[PDB]
Amino acid sequence: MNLESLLHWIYVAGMTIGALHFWSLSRNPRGVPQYEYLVAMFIPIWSGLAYMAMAIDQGKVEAAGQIAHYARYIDWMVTTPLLLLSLSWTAMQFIKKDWTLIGFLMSTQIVVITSGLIADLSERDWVRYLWYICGVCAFLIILWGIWNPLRAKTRTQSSELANLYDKLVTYFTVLWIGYPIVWIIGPSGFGWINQTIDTFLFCLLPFFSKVGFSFLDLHGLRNLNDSRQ
Numbered sequence: 001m002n003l004e005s006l007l008h009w010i011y012v013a014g015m016t017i018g019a020l021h022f023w024s025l026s027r028n029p030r031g032v033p034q035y036e037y038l039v040a041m042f043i044p045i046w047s048g049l050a051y052m053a054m055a056i057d058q059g060k061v062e063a064a065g066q067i068a069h070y071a072r073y074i075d076w077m078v079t080t081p082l083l084l085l086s087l088s089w090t091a092m093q094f095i096k097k098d099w100t101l102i103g104f105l106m107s108t109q110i111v112v113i114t115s116g117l118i119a120d121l122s123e124r125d126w127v128r129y130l131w132y133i134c135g136v137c138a139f140l141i142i143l144w145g146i147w148n149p150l151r152a153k154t155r156t157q158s159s160e161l162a163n164l165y166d167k168l169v170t171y172f173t174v175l176w177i178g179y180p181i182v183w184i185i186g187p188s189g190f191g192w193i194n195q196t197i198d199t200f201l202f203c204l205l206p207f208f209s210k211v212g213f214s215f216l217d218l219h220g221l222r223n224l225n226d227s228r229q
């Protein structure tokens with residue numbers, strides 16, 4: 001384990017091998033249609049190149065005598081918005097519609113994260129704290145909105161996938177607990193954190209989220225067969 005100024009670099013590295021492994025699995029998914037595998041190329045690849053930029057010093061710019069984390073939000077979009085969607089996509093067996101219920105939900109998280117970018121691209125302070133609460137609020141409403149209904153779509157699809165799924169959304173919910181909690185106290189960290197040390201607490205954290213949830217998504221759908229004896 002290293003502890004120097006090369007996090008953003010080593011980050012894109014691990015992400016490169018990740019999205020690659022999936023390419024080898026394209027031979028056949030078994031449990032997740034093509035559109036899902038594509039989801040990987042979508043986020044796993046995009047996220048990768050993103051970090052590589054943070055290393056070259058091309059992402060954050062000085063705006064209003066301050067430091068804005070623009071590159072941090074955009075990457076957090078395709079990464080975060082498609083992170084939660086990836087969990088559901090991986091579970092999804094087949095498709096033949098759009099559905100209004102789920103359709104509305106997906107639009108909820110989409111708007112929340114959007115607020116994030118603005119939070120950094122704000123114009124005043126009073127609006128910063130105001131917007132910050134705008135996201136967290138709609139967030140807790142989303143998670144509770146997915147387990148609350150529980151339409152027959154899932155209850156009929158496969159009880160097995162419905163069970164393991166519950167444990168999934170739970171683990172992912174913890175990932176947020178990691179960021180939404182450090183965000184509140186201290187400046188985007190634990191407290192009295194600098195600009196460098198700050199990006200560190202994170203680099204270690206989305207790196208631990210993508211890697212973990214990765215093996216979790218696949219493990220959930222199918223880990224091992226232990227029925228016949």
Ligand SMILES: *C/C=C(C)/C=C/C=C(C)/C=C/C1=C(C)CCCC1(C)C
Pocket residue numbers: 076079080083112113115116119132135136139175176179180183205206207209210
């Ligand atoms: C792998 C990358 C991850 C897990 C990124 C996660 C980002 C978040 C959980 C952001 C959460 C936010 C709020 C809860 C309030 C609004 C501002 C955000 C978007 C930073």
